[PDB]
Amino acid sequence: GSSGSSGTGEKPYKCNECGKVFTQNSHLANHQRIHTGVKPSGPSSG
Ligand SMILES: [Zn+2]
């Protein structure tokens, strides 16, 4: 199962999605936001 060598890098917080890194955790989490659907469902109107 895709048991290949695609993901080298020992970091505390890395956005595997793109390949970035953030000292803090929140930074990475908030960033991952762009790596997922963000349709205007809540009280937001785009
Ligand atoms: Zn990213």
UniProtKB/Swiss-Prot annotation:
Q: Where does this one sit in the cell?
A: Nucleus
- Which residues of the whole protein does the chain here span? 508 to 540 of 839
Write out the similarity annotation. Belongs to the krueppel C2H2-type zinc-finger protein family.
Show the taxonomic lineage. Eukaryota, Metazoa, Chordata, Craniata, Vertebrata
Q: What is this protein called?
A: Zinc finger protein 347
Zinc finger motifs (C2H2-type), residue ranges: 13-35
Q: What does this protein do?
A: May be involved in transcriptional regulation.
